[PDB]
Design a protein around this ligand. Structure first.
Ligand SMILES: Cc1[nH]c2ccc(Cl)cc2c1CCN
Ligand SMILES: [Ca+2]
Ligand SMILES: [Ca+2]
Ligand SMILES: [Ca+2]
Ligand SMILES: [Ca+2]
Length: 212
């Protein structure tokens, strides 16, 4: 028989065991048929994730999936007559694990550093920060990053002298007045928010050094 690939959102919560699909042998007219399942997730590590009911053929999921651990399973179903003979061809069972937004973006570094000549103009780029989200960024924004500036210290000649590009993470100088003799170094706190700014948010540091 044939089962069409099955899409299960990770991190579900049943109730378990959850019935995913029912395997059927045509030959249950000449005998009772005993069903069984084999493959990664069933009888090899990680064992017990999937299972099939001996008599009914109901395909079972026994625990929530974690797409970030195993995104896809390829199981194999088998029909055995009561007298012990295999009655069908081994049927492939495809399980695809679909993403929920269960990861917080992380900066590639705890502290990014960069320099600029005291005299550069507003609009000048200093550095490019990056954050990585293990969630899916293809069909959803669960792993898309929005960048923000958390805070600026110190605040002379005033606050918010830097902006960050929302998608690229490029930090730029937006105001005049830089001066090494007055403030050699600015310590920015940077933020990264998945769902393109709507979800979880993590922080890092950006140290901008002012070059005489
Ligand atoms: C590839 C794919 N296709 C989907 C179709 C529907 C839903 Cl809700 C989610 C998905 C995903 C995310 C898996 N990374
Ligand atoms: Ca997960
Ligand atoms: Ca995420
Ligand atoms: Ca996820
Ligand atoms: Ca929110």
């Amino acid at each position: 028989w044939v089962v069409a690939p099955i899409s299960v959102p990770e991190n579900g919560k049943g109730p378990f065991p959850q019935r995913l699909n029912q395997l059927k042998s045509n030959k249950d007219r000449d005998t009772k048929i005993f069903y069984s399942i084999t493959g990664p997730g069933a009888d090899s590590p990680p064992e017990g994730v999937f299972a099939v009911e001996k008599e009914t053929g109901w395909l079972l999921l026994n625990k929530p999936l974690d797409r970030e651990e195993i995104a896809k399973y390829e199981l194999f179903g088998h029909a055995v007559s009561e007298n012990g003979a295999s009655v069908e061809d081994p049927m492939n069972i495809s399980i695809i694990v679909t993403d929920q937004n269960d990861h917080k973006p992380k900066f590639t570094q705890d502290t990014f550093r960069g320099s600029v000549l005291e005299g550069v103009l507003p609009g000048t780029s200093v550095m490019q920060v990056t954050a990585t989200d293990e969630d899916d960024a293809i069909y959803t924004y669960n792993g898309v990053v929005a960048y923000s500036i958390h805070s600026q210290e110190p605040k002379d000649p005033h606050d918010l002298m830097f902006t960050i590009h929302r998608s690229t993470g490029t930090i730029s100088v937006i105001s005049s007045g830089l001066d090494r003799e007055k403030v050699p170094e600015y310590t920015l706190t940077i933020q990264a928010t998945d769902m393109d700014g709507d979800g979880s948010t993590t922080t890092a540091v950006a140290v901008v050094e002012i070059l005489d």
